[PDB]
Design a protein around this nucleic acid. Structure first.
Ligand SMILES: Nc1ccn([C@H]2C[C@H](O)[C@@H](COP(=O)(O)OP(=O)(O)OP(=O)(O)O)O2)c(=O)n1
Ligand SMILES: [Mg+2]
Ligand SMILES: [Mg+2]
Ligand SMILES: [Mg+2]
Ligand code: NA
Length: 383
DNA sequence: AGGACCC
DNA sequence: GGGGTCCT
């Protein structure tokens, strides 16, 4: 039952894609901009003080000569992200995506099949590729260490193929489960890889300084733990299971406390094609109102091409909006409805827009002043 | 339809 | 910001 899981995580992904298109940017500090946001930047910019998700002002001041490129259209990042998953799928079919630039692959079978092929006296020649977390000593007679080192060799083949075939560099983490592979993959960056031997697990988990650093504990849950006086990984590990459940539900409570020890039994699952296709536009009060028709028509036009290009067809459409002000929860609202079977045919635009516009009015009272900062359209329930 | 999480 | 996943 012991697995060897690899987590691959590309370097500064959007900036990396822009640097490749336009090598004139290869040596300049570079930031990818969406509205007033520097969503990410290359490693030249992270030297000069720029952070991911820093607004343009803080970043131009921290680095005046920061070159900026617009990254609001994700089409190119999207396309590259699938070329990566597809290439990893040649190694093992079951690849799980997490966002546009991370993949997990279960290497156990590949590892076992490579071990099956080594003769008695070349087992002792097995070596690591890249870093060993916490510099831990290898024990060549420990079969778990052996299988992890073969895992590290496979990861280095995957990184070399991504570079040689797609021009992309990234990091990899090899460990016994997904949580640990993903934590260890960030230890040496950019463009490096690390393997976690089982004895250093507690060390890696206790190296985190904030409980939100655990994948699966987000903004909301962390705020609730903070309020319970839970602040370190160890505070979570040792806190009352009963009380935790009462304050967060058997579900959230029991999975996070498990994660706090480094335990994660979830399988790597095959992502395959996408479950939804969406586009959004953000703006400052631009919409009020029914020119949204324009706005909604443009989203729709690009979305229609994507779903067309996909070749499965969608059966539900949804419209998402967001309303202006204030310090409270500015949550989104939406309306969905099925797409008429006759329309399921890829004129199209006109009845698709009529539908969206109806969903629009259902949400917004057109008789008073509107109040909108976001329009989004989603196609889903693909079939 | 909303919400939590991820990138 | 501009995307995604799955759950209640
Ligand atoms: N809240 C977020 C997080 C990420 N991204 C985008 C920008 C990144 O280029 C890409 C990958 O996210 P990562 O967190 O892996 O960030 P990077 O790949 O840019 O940097 P690193 O080298 O730290 O992985 O997803 C985004 O738009 N919004
Ligand atoms: Mg990442
Ligand atoms: Mg990355
Ligand atoms: Mg991915
Ligand atoms: Na987290």
């Amino acid at each position: 039952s012991s697995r060897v899981i690899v987590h691959v995580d590309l370097d500064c992904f959007y900036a990396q894609v822009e640097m490749i298109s336009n090598p004139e940017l290869k040596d300049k500090p570079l930031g990818v901009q969406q509205k007033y946001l520097v969503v990410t930047c290359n490693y030249e910019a992270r030297k000069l003080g720029v952070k991911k998700l820093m607004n343009v002002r803080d970043a131009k001041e921290k680095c005046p000569q920061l070159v900026l490129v617009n990254g609001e259209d994700l089409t190119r990042y999207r396309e590259m992200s699938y070329k990566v998953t597809e290439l990893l799928e040649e190694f093992s079919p079951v690849v799980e995506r997490l966002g546009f630039d991370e993949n997990f692959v279960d290497l156990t079978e590949m590892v076992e099949k490579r071990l099956q092929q080594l003769q008695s006296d070349e087992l002792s020649a097995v070596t690591v590729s890249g870093h060993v977390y916490n510099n831990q000593s290898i024990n060549l007679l420990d079969v778990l260490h052996i299988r992890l080192l073969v895992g590290s060799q496979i990861a280095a083949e995957m990184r070399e193929a991504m570079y040689n075939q797609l021009g992309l560099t990234g990091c990899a983490g090899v460990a016994s489960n997904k949580l640990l592979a993903k934590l260890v993959s960030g230890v040496f960056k950019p463009n490096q890889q690390t393997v976690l031997l089982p004895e250093s697990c507690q060390h890696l988990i206790h190296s985190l300084n904030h409980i939100k650093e655990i994948p699966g504990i987000g903004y909301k849950t962390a705020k609730c733990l903070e309020a319970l006086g839970i602040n370190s990984v160890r505070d979570l590990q040792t806190f009352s299971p009963k009380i935790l459940e009462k304050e967060l539900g058997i579900s959230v409570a029991q999975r996070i406390q498990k994660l706090s020890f480094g335990e994660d039994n979830s399988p790597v699952i095959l992502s395959g094609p996408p479950q939804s296709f969406s586009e959004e536009d953000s703006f400052k009060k631009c919409s009020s109102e029914v020119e949204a028709k324009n706005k909604i028509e443009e989203l729709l036009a690009s979305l229609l091409n994507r779903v067309c290009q996909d070749g499965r067809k969608p059966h539900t459409v949804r419209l998402i909006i967001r309303r202006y002000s204030s310090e409270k929860h500015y949550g989104r609202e939406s309306r969905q409805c099925p797409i008429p079977s006759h329309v399921i045919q890829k004129d199209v635009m006109t009845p698709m827009v009529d539908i969206l516009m109806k969903l629009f009015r259902n949400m917004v009272n057109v008789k008073m002043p509107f109040h909108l900062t976001l329009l989004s359209v989603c196609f889903c329930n693909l079939k």
